[PDB]
Design a protein around this ligand. Structure first.
Ligand SMILES: [Ca+2]
Ligand SMILES: [Ca+2]
Ligand SMILES: [Ca+2]
Ligand SMILES: [Ca+2]
Ligand SMILES: [Cl-]
Lengths: 399, 397
């Protein structure tokens, strides 16, 4: 009947027991009150409890690193990320060297959050893409460009057959092309291009502006034919995103971008674990596709967090599963490894992989489809690339 | 700091010879992405405005600061555009920390700022020329409305300016926020004919985002003295809408909950003065709660001085009242006067409820300490005719 949080913290050994008891009482009932007999027993049900204390290491300076588990009765929450976060890591987040490592959430509480509107199966159905990883391209340049220039850049990507093209997450200025004008325009270009490719390439548009008009804008963008909404979830807040995922009129998948999240998880000894920030919380908030740093870029999340992250996105539960879109180091040569890591339920999140291709974005996209083909037919890339110049060039530049 | 750009300073670790390349790539990559149309788009391109080496490692690494200028033209007036730009993708690039933002007035004015500020809060409460005294509920979840009314009464009987919900008070099963405000307002008026002061009530503002503004208005109209807001948990833009709304005609009290997850580490995240100072004033906090220098864990001297400066520096927006927390007891009041001057909220939890004579005397002991300071009489001397202050000195010194 409670959320059980696990914290990693540094302190002195003989303080651990009192510090844990103070947390369990102070962050639930606050303190015991001079009430009559019946009232105490009733109030007791709102009180937290210490579930476990585990010393991980003893330092020569006398400090210990320990894990503490605290149970917070669900009856004190109100079904929002605010209530959850302020309770489990609100004031506690400031208490020196301490980090939230795990949240075990009871079914009753999980079900008060919306979860993905579409999930894996609904994204596939919307885009008509089955039995293969999806391919996504990212705009190399946005700010400063005219709508016409933007359209051409969209066309180049779509001519490579990609399933999805996303705005760069930094695209905020509406001086040259408003989000609504971009959705309309890229729709038409996509229609033209599908006549050669056989696929209408979808557009993930950055969801931006003031909170109070965000849900109405999300609705308009859906109505205008957006393929997905790109949302900087952590910048806006999880509850903000939750309302979007819950609203039936926001009839479009959410593409969760991790911007700002590293400020929470980057440190090994402070903050909140990356699998919670980018995994657990994202699925609850309603991301249909989740972008997170891959194990193949310069800076990873590390093995352990990355596995826990994926399991958060995929674990059997009351909400739909989320498509992982791991970022950085994504090239056609990595495709077979990516099949092994994630299976077919995967978004190939390409950026430099598309635009860095010697033959242009068009070729950059074809390359990924060539590797997808090779895998599906048990053909080695190097072998497949004998008949496919796109893959050939991609194998040349990046291995 | 350029008139046309926000300049962010980052502390980071990298190879020495890599700094220029990394800085240049940031400047371009986070503004235009990549390259006679040039001079047109050049207006949106960022630039490197400083590279400073702080410490050389034997592993060939350096700790350094880099300053990047981000054209204001690329932003849209929201915290989301600001944060995602200066520390979105960048926040995940290993050991790097956002240390400073120098923002032009043209950008600052895109944000609401405090509706009341220091001067507005004093006029609303009618409390001038002295620190304000604020008490926090010691227990909330699971008590009944009547038990909660009695609790509020005890704190108000001490004559305090302000009583705030505990920031963890979410459950509405026993007493709704609407119900508490109605009942506490009625209690405060009963007590004011004995204390001569109508103790205001800062209520925890809670619930889904889509109905928060409507609720803020209702609570203001019902007579809340202020709204307690877990700003970091909800998001700064959520809170900016509150500060901009004329019908949310009550002060905002910013609680720092969740903030430590951003600033706690020395080598990652965002500096505490930015999170709890610079950003709070822009978002519209009238009173800002942050860890004092007198509890177990502080922000450190330097951060604290920077934070207080963000709250007070003359600029487009009104100044914010500081409410330093932890270790706040009557015995500390002279020191707090020296550090903060009279524009200060004395933010007591344990200092009030932990008093030997209960909540009434706890608050009374704080006004005793204020009297002693105002008159240049040492607390030890003032306690001779002031039992509430005497008992506080006995317990905490
Ligand atoms: Ca649902
Ligand atoms: Ca990007
Ligand atoms: Ca204003
Ligand atoms: Ca509190
Ligand atoms: Cl650290």
């Amino acid at each position: 009947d409670a959320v059980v949080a696990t914290y990693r913290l540094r302190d002195r050994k003989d303080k651990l027991e009192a510090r844990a008891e103070g947390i369990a009482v102070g962050l639930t009932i606050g303190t015991w009150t001079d009430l009559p007999a019946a009232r105490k027993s009733e109030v007791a049900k709102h009180c937290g409890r210490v579930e476990g204390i585990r010393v991980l290491d003893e330092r020569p300076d006398g400090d210990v690193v320990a894990e503490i588990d605290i149970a917070y009765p669900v009856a004190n929450l109100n079904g929002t990320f605010a209530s959850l976060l302020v309770t489990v890591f609100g004031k506690l987040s400031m208490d020196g060297e301490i980090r939230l490592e795990r949240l075990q959430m009871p079914d009753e509480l999980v079900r008060q959050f919306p979860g993905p509107k579409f999930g894996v199966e609904g994204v596939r159905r919307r885009l008509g893409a089955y039995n293969r990883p999806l391919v996504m391209s990212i705009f190399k340049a946005c700010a400063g460009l005219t709508l016409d220039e933007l359209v051409e850049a969209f066309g180049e990507q779509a001519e490579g057959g990609v399933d999805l093209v996303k705005d760069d997450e930094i695209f905020f200025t509406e001086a040259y092309a408003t989000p609504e004008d971009r959705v309309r325009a890229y729709a038409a270009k996509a229609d033209e291009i599908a006549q050669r490719t056989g696929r209408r390439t979808a557009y993930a548009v950055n969801l931006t502006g003031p909170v109070h008009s965000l849900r109405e804008r999300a609705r308009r963008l859906a109505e205008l034919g957006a393929g997905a909404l790109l949302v900087n979830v952590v910048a806006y807040g999880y509850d903000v995103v939750a309302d979007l995922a819950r609203d039936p009129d926001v009839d479009v998948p959410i593409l969760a971008h991790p911007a700002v999240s590293g400020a929470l998880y980057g440190s090994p000894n402070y903050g909140i674990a990356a699998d919670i920030v980018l995994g657990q919380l994202m699925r609850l908030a309603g991301a249909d596709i989740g972008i997170f740093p891959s194990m193949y870029g310069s800076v990873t999340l590390g093995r352990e967090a990355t596995d826990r992250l994926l399991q958060h996105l995929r674990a059997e539960g009351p909400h739909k599963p989320v498509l992982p879109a791991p970022s950085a180091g994504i090239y056609p040569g990595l495709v077979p490894r990516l099949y092994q890591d994630f299976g077919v339920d995967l978004v190939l999140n390409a950026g430099g992989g598309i635009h860095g291709h010697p033959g242009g974005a068009r070729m950059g996209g074809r390359a990924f489809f060539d590797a997808i083909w090779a895998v599906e037919h048990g053909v080695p890339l190097e072998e497949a690339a004998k008949d496919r110049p796109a893959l050939r060039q991609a194998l040349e530049k990046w291995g």
